[PDB]
Ligand binder design. Structure first.
Ligand SMILES: NC(=O)c1cc([N+](=O)[O-])c(Cl)cc1NCc1cnc(N)nc1
Length: 294
């Protein structure tokens, strides 16, 4: 509003426009997201407001929710860069394993926290993971997708990224579980390691088939109930599971083991954030300093 001097437009955020802004009073620099509409639901107000108490070091703090004049403003703690930009910037050399491990570990701590408080992210992707110079990484936009159905096209009709969507969502499941976030994080882990998106689908069916081509078309053996899912079709081609060592080379077996558990088809077999934190892969985790050029 007028209490915020806009510094620059960060982008066309998932729900709306995002600006880097400074509070004229406090001098605090924040990210301000403007969200779209018949007056903006009041149901979302109670919901969003609840997320203000969801405070954790690996969760971008939601400082304030402001509903006014058919506009909804979300004020967030500001971080200078997202993981997508960082991965692009580290494309030639790759993110060092120690840093990949630190980020994965921190993200799992953040998910463990949200999940223990019954909050799901639902739309984890590199762009929603913010990083700073201290080596921290934080989850952004956590429980927002709840009172906002399912993404598809931002106000600028931008294409919704399905690359990190769990198979149960693609198969039409009506109830998401914490497992969807573990799946997305597994996809991100793989991408940090290989420097290439794991399943870059360009349509819902292409996304699903890319997953099937790599992990094998799921069946009742590995995923009880899958053939009864809303969008499951007996006509799906049946692809054999690819040898896992081919998926994220040259990741070591500790890493491959954890990733395999984060990508199990059955949401109920998929590892929890809490359990993943105890995986041997993190035995030598540390907190390196990233090379950020702001
Ligand atoms: N909380 C935040 O700091 C933040 C929030 C949103 N958002 O609520 O939509 C977005 Cl896009 C980006 C953010 N920061 C990363 C960033 C900073 N600067 C520039 N130029 N690009 C990215």
């Amino acid at each position: 509003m007028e209490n915020f001097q806009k510094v620059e437009k960060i982008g066309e955020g998932t729900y709306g426009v995002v600006y880097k802004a400074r509070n004229k009073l406090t001098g605090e620099v924040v990210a301000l997201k403007k969200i779209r509409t018949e007056g903006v639901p009041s149901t979302a107000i109670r919901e969003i407001s609840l997320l203000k108490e969801l405070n954790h070091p690996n969760i971008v703090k939601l400082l304030d929710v402001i509903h006014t004049e058919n506009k909804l403003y979300l004020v967030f703690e500001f971080l200078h860069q997202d993981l997508k930009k960082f991965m692009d910037a580290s494309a030639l050399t790759g993110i060092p394993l120690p840093l990949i491990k630190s980020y994965l570990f921190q993200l799992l701590q953040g998910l463990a926290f949200c999940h223990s408080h019954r909050v799901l992210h639902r739309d984890l992707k590199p762009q929603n993971l913010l990083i700073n110079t201290e080596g921290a990484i934080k989850l952004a936009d956590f429980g927002l997708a709840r009172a906002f159905g399912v993404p598809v096209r931002t106000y600028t009709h931008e294409v919704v990224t399905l690359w990190y969507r769990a198979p149960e969502i693609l198969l039409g499941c009506k109830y998401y579980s914490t497992a969807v976030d573990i799946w997305s994080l597994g996809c991100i882990f793989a991408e940090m390691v290989t420097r290439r998106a794991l399943f870059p689908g360009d349509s819902e069916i292409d996304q699903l088939f890319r997953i099937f081509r790599t992990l094998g078309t799921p069946d009742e053996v590995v995923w009880p109930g899958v053939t009864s899912m809303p969008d499951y079709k007996p006509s799906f081609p049946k692809w054999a599971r690819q040898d896992f060592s081919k998926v994220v080379p040259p990741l070591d077996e500790d890493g491959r083991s954890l990733l395999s558990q984060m990508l199990h088809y059955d949401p109920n077999k998929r590892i929890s954030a809490k359990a993943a934190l105890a995986h041997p892969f993190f035995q030598d985790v540390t907190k390196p300093v990233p090379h950020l050029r702001l």
